[PDB]
Amino acid sequence: LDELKKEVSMDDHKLSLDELHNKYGTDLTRGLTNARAKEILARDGPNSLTPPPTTPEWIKFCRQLFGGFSILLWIGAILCFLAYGIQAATEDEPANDNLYLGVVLSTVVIVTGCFSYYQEAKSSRIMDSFKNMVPQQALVIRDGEKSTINAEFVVAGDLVEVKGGDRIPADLRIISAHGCKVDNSSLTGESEPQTRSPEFSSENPLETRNIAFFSTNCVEGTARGVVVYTGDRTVMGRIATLASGLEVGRTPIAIEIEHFIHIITGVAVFLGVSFFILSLILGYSWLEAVIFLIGIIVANVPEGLLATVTVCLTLTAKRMARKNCLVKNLEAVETLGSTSTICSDKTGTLTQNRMTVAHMWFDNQIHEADTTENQSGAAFDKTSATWSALSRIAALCNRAVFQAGQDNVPILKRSVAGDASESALLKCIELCCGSVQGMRDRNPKIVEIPFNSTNKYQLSIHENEKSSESRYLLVMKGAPERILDRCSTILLNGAEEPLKEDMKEAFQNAYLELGGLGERVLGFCHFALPEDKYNEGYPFDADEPNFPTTDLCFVGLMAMIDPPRAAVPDAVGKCRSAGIKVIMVTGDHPITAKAIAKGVGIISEGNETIEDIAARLNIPIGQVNPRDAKACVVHGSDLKDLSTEVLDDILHYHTEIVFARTSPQQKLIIVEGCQRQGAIVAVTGDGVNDSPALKKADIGVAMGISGSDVSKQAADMILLDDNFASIVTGVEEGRLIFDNLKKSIAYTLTSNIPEITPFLVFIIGNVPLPLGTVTILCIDLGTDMVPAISLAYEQAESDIMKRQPRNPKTDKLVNERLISMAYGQIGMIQALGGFFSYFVILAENGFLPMDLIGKRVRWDDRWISDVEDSFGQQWTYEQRKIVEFTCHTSFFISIVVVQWADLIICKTRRNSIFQQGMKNKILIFGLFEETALAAFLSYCPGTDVALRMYPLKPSWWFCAFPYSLIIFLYDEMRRFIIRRSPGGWVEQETYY
Amino acid sequence: EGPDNDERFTYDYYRLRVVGLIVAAVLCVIGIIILLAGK
Amino acid sequence: FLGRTGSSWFKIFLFYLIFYGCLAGIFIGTIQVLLLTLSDFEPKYQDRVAPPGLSHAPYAIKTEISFSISNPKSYESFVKSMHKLMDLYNESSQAGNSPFEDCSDTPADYIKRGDLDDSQGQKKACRFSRMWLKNCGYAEGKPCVVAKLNRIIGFYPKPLKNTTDLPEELQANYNQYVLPLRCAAREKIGSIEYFGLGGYAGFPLQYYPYYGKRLQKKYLQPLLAIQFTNLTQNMELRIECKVYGENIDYSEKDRFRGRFEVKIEVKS
């Protein structure tokens, strides 16, 4: 469906003005007829974007109500009402058991539904942001007259007019223009104004001057044009549809959840029906056969687990909110940890998005300035008298000014009225020479010649601030070579000197080096005009050369670039140390893209492209073995004629990849290419041209300050302070939460065994029921909750940023090793500790373990109010039941006591508690509150009716203590083996 | 005692409950103290 | 295979065999020590049987015994359980001076055979003739229910003293030696008739205290036969038999705590 939109567009900028009118039945001068425009409206439809059909929240909520655990809990809830129905008909049961348990279980499903619904959130308003880029109104020429109309009423063929400050209402063929410049950052991510004129200037319509696009704005001048595309058919309207239309897809974390749901659901249905038939064979009435099944359901399903996961995710997202990293989708909290490839935009993401002075060439020396936002570098020069001469030209031969009321904000961050290069120079001098306004007050400008297309220079004449002179100084800047052809002397370390071929060659060298760094280079020179030849009232003519512009003194060079953000180089290296592959994907030109790649460490030192090898060896590129080149730089124009299989080979064959001059669909294609190889991919960006890629990414991260509204709609995560170091933190947090989920899951599952085994022995042994159904829910929904959550606050056991990204195909959240430990080893020890306390309670009340076998028949018989114990005493029905429920209560408390040790062992997968310590305060809180809850549930009056919880005698609490301790020792010995031999036996069997 | 051994079939479940609830409360307070050591 | 290789499948079996073996051996060990802390003659706790339960022979479907006099197999169900109990009180079962003893044919005081020790043989229990149960196949019309006080080791059932007012106000009040049992329903549409030891409507105190199964096997607890020769027919009659005493109490939950709940209906 969207495969059409993933392709590069076709256009009609090659046609003549006249020819273009024939195609659209239009007038170049009079414009369309009121009737013809209305006709075309009904024909083509409105100049608007329609949002894609969404899935209502209704269906979204209910889709969770049927996912493995909820299905089993539904079967339980209904099976409760089943047994209740069968009762209400047969023998009038005045009880509330099956009825209430059926109500409780149905509530558990609904509430669990809210948790998973909260986790599976999708806040997407892509198409809405795009719609915000179409103006409310447009100016059209109809019947030879200009009028404002609803922009939706704009059709292909009419004559539109735009001017500085307004949004392009539709894709236009420029037919007339006067000084028109446009901001195409929507399509390129670059905000430098692009001229628009009627002349065709490139085969590529996205590069030609005679096309203006919807989603962009006119920055200055005026233009008229013929509408060629409207609504969804515009270049960026298609990007809108592509972006808004892209299928979301399941996250890595989501896939893991479903996976263990299958496992646990599997064992549940297995043991469920395996013992349902095992009971009927033993001659159990279907009346009972279902009651046992309900218990089996409740025992096997970890009722509180899915909600635990959600809370652990939420708590991890809260910590990241506190580092200026907003998470829109709870699952995106983990994806960053599983990320193996980052596709990053350059401008406004890796870079500050601001022309900044990078180097200066004066005194036959290359000086480097500090490009960082917060200025974390050092000085370059202050002493040289040459510097002050260059500094003066940079301030004086400059027409840029700071906007009013910025004195509060830092120099480099403040808004400037002017072109990017003049702003850069302004901020450079203001920083290291103080107020520039001061320099422009001490040296009043009397005449100037602003930068001309033809002159290729800008000159200014000022009254020298010096009192002993107060004469006229000439300054000029422009193209380095043009400035050179106008110089005779060079200000070396203070004093001038003739411009010999020697210094002239050093100039060329300096010029070539700075240009090689991808930096824009300017020349600077001045000339102190002779006093006798220029009186204090001498008039200077700016129109006609009234003053010399030759034999001037060359002062120096200055170079500039849109520099990396301070934290970016280090963040890139850190991603790469964690084994994450970092690719650059930018709409910017290749020379600039490549230079920043080396600056931030995308391309490491020494690594070459095929083009680099060819130039170094002075040989044809076809003569170069492409396997000798680990780095590559792909232009979008070449990308366009490559198949995906060939794109896949590029991705496979290079470690250091730069995709430059890419369109928005091309970014999507590169992302998909990476994913196709089985990689989890993150995208980082800030422009509307990142929207499709951000949507398709497993996780999209947008910049918060510099980011466009669209990009932040398309993302899963926002960096609110533009701190790229947050990606590094995000991946670290993502890995940590993945491990801690394992700990929390194992902990929760472990207590399933002591809830399952009592029901089994109840059938096979014919003893009184050791633990009840209600009692199970008091564990999974009550006591285990806070402890399970607390594992989310566990510190790393080792340097997680030192390991490679997990293999999502092999490294699962819940594997066989977890089940073996939780179900086969620790849970089994917990089961016994439960049974022990059960036998203790009964034996101390007169029913010794031996006489318990095959007694349930008489025990449950409501009409036998005289059962004989081991000592020959006789018990009524309600009397023995009180002891039985007291058994449920102590078995319950036994679970809590054995979960104490389990909580401590689940703390660490490898390390010892004596190494990791007990610095998790939430965990300790869990221990205290868990025990408080259990005690309250046993001793609070009335709980014997609502939950069948009975007061325990002090000695009862200590039954499971020896089992709780064996768990601690056992797991500590086991992990001691793991560490002592990384070999594999204990490791490959039990290492979560 | 002999025929007056009524205490043999008696248990102070009332005191046990009072003590049990005291303990539960104090464990609840202790927990808050440790948690609130930083919020 | 599914998971691993044969070598791995073996090792995982050798482990869980030794592992579960140890766990079973430990579990058994903790059961040993538990038993080691317990007496053979007396249970550690008795507060959960404390107030004695009162149970009868007619096995009630739901605290009810409804049947038809004009039908044979209508009551043959209740006669099965009635027979089961009384079959134990046979004279052929009580033979010789061992381990039985002839006790007062009239309600007497308690009998202490020492302590709950094995320092003596089987503590000798009082004989009880089912022949003390006058009038009661059994009552084919108007049932002859048999009551019973639940056995508790070392329990001395103490009758109420005639200090103040009483339900069966002072009638045949053998204050010193009889634990009374008065059945009731207002709703007085019946005819209560009690049979027992010495002809009294109670339990003779000479059968106490019970020394337990280990120290007193073949021991016989006193019975109290109750006959309802009611002149009514074809209606549910809620009859409650209540025992009175210093050590006797009741509960709204446990409807068998020192009392009966019988729903007789001679629907004939």
Ligand SMILES: *[C@@H]1O[C@H](CO)[C@@H](O[C@@H]2O[C@H](CO)[C@@H](O)[C@H](O)[C@H]2NC(C)=O)[C@H](O)[C@H]1NC(C)=O
């Ligand atoms: C306990 O006493 C009952 C009294 O009914 C015995 O029942 C006797 O059963 C035999 C054989 O079935 C009959 O011939 C008699 O008529 C019954 N009564 C009597 C008085 O002998 C019963 O057999 C006795 N049980 C034991 C174990 O001795």
Ligand SMILES: CC(C)CCC[C@@H](C)[C@H]1CC[C@H]2[C@@H]3CC=C4C[C@@H](O)CC[C@]4(C)[C@H]3CC[C@]12C
């Ligand atoms: C109540 C009692 C009788 C039930 C005992 C169940 C035992 C036999 C179960 C419980 C957990 C189980 C193990 C759980 C995990 C694994 C790892 C997997 O890669 C192979 C199977 C294996 C090794 C299972 C084998 C059987 C097992 C040990």
Ligand SMILES: *[C@@H]1O[C@H](CO)[C@@H](O)[C@H](O)[C@H]1NC(C)=O
């Ligand atoms: C009980 O049986 C005796 C004979 O043993 C008889 O005289 C008497 O009438 C019976 N009593 C009743 C109330 O039927």
Ligand SMILES: [K+]
């Ligand atoms: K995404």
Ligand SMILES: [Mg+2]
């Ligand atoms: Mg950008």
Ligand SMILES: [Tl+]
């Ligand atoms: Tl469970």
Ligand SMILES: [Tl+]
């Ligand atoms: Tl659990």
